[PDB]
């Protein structure tokens, strides 16, 4: 399908940035996670980034570590996550859906079979957090055979060789890292990335989304100003879940408030 290409063309027509929330599938349970995701979309999310709970999320800080643990406390499995993905797509035909995976969950029952299941449920992209471009060949090949965009991370450290590789190999969007370290709202990135954003456009890369530490409206506007196509936010979204565990209704109200503010910051 062409869901990212259609989204970025529509956003470009409106001189608009993308706002893309991350959540963990099944955090804090399947039913409440489906309600959370519908609330994110109704509040104006342009695309989704969705994590499958994994025992060892070594690219994630404590907020998303604790999201994975809540989903496991609710008995959430990868099979249940794919059932959720099919339902989400059945409700929402055009929104791009990206997964954040760890390699073992993709490799476990065969790389090709993983990407075939992605295609069946209507996923648009997969970011495998612990597969660097150097190891990516079988993942990107399987992704593209099943009409899935393989997403790569561009560190702020990225040398010219790596920018060329990410530009050549990635599709859908380029994940522009704000900083070194792991996911978390407590650490803000401070890279102008004007040159990285400029070099990616020169090398005809998929449009850049700036992510890691994006927690406020001004960071969304700043990302777009710097020439990024949009911004991704997770720990900030997940923190609203963690804060409001005792009140599922207030949790949805605060998620709606936050996403509506972050999306407003992307508009012309």
């Amino acid at each position: 399908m062409e869901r990212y290409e259609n989204l970025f063309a529509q956003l470009n027509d409106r001189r608009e940035g993308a706002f893309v929330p991350f959540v963990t599938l099944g955090d804090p349970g399947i039913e409440q996670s489906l309600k959370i995701i519908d609330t994110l979309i109704d509040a104006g999310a342009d695309a989704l980034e969705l994590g499958v709970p994994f025992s060892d999320p070594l690219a994630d800080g404590p907020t998303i570590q604790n999201a994975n643990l809540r989903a496991f406390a609710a008995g959430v499995t990868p099979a249940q996550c794919f059932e959720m993905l099919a339902l989400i797509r059945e409700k929402h035909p055009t929104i791009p859906i990206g997964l954040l995976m760890y390699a073992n969950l993709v490799f476990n029952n065969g790389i090709d079979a993983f990407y075939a299941r992605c295609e069946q449920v209507g996923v648009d992209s997969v970011l495998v957090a612990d597969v660097p471009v150097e190891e990516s060949a079988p993942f990107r090949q399987a992704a593209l055979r099943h009409n899935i965009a393989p997403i790569f991370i561009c560190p702020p450290n990225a040398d010219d060789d790596l920018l060329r590789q990410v530009a050549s190999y990635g599709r859908g969007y380029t994940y522009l890292l704000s900083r070194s370290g792991v996911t978390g709202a407590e650490n803000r990135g401070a890279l102008p990335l004007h040159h990285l954003i400029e070099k990616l456009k020169e090398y005809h890369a998929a449009p850049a989304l700036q992510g890691f530490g994006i927690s406020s409206p001004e960071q969304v506007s700043a990302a777009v100003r710097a020439g990024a196509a949009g911004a991704i936010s997770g720990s900030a979204i997940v923190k609203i879940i963690e804060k409001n565990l005792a009140s599922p209704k207030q949790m949805l109200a605060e998620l709606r408030s936050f996403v509506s503010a972050m999306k407003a910051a992307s508009r012309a």
Partner: protein
Amino acid sequence: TTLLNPYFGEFGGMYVPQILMPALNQLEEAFVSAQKDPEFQAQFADLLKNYAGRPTALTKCQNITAGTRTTLYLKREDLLHGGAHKTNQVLGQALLAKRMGKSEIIAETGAGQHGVASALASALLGLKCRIYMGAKDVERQSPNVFRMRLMGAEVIPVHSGSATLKDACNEALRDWSGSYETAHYMLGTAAGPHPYPTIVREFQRMIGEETKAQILDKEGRLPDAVIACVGGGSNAIGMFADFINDTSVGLIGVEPGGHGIETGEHGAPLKHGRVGIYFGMKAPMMQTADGQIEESYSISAGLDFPSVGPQHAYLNSIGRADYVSITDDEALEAFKTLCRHEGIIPALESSHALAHALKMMREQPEKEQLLVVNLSGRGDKDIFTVHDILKAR
């Protein structure tokens, strides 16, 4: 691109977030340079001799083998400073850290021997050491935690996931992914992403080099087999490396069988797990059917790394090395036998290697065989574990 092959056949690789690739490339380049540098080799040899106590003895065990055609030697890594083989490679990695201009060390530890080894190397060489340890392990390894703190290391309990070794491995990599410019990650076994399996082998290979020289001197020939326990693979690859090209020499790795392979309560991923991708490598893993990483179980917590070094998976796949398992009860009997018949208290880890050599002898007592067991550590640390089991019999 890399200078060295990151794979052993299909096994190994560099499965880390992109942000960590420069740290691994920097480490590989420093290692390749260090291995060509006579000054680095001389400094490492000086520390191994004058601080750690190398060469270690090779002890013949005539009381154990009496009345059989087995000759059994023990390579005495239990006599190395710190009481286990881990000291060899932490001294080399600490020197690599200094070669790269780093002043800080990060280490993971399970039962605590790698934490203690990392802390003692850091104390000697003037490095600031922080050690991640699963909160469950912190709770049950107070002696090793106290040793690390006496040596000036920071011990950081890890509460995420299962609060055990794999979770400390994750936390060490999360820290390194922000701190690599000033901190070296001193990985504790011959596993993880390239170049660690290669580095740890080369910084342990004096075990096998000395064993070869010592057995030639005493016996005038190579061993029929060298036998080593396999938790993550470092003491075994250190014994095996110098014999790999001696095709007459058996290489036997012993994984923990725990309560028995059939119970599922074991730590034998190489022969009874499933290949996966975790901790930066493609290797056999303890994992659920769904691909969630599991714990290894053994009476010996030191054998509970829930995967295995990729070079062992490779040597197995080509038939150069053979891998077996030994249960808790077999290891316990070997522990008691060595104490009573040789006056050596072995680590329960090493007791798994000895138990398999005892089986090789007892099953075929008229088979002529010259065996070397890598006695990877001493077992003072295990006497209460053994007391608690014996007392409950």
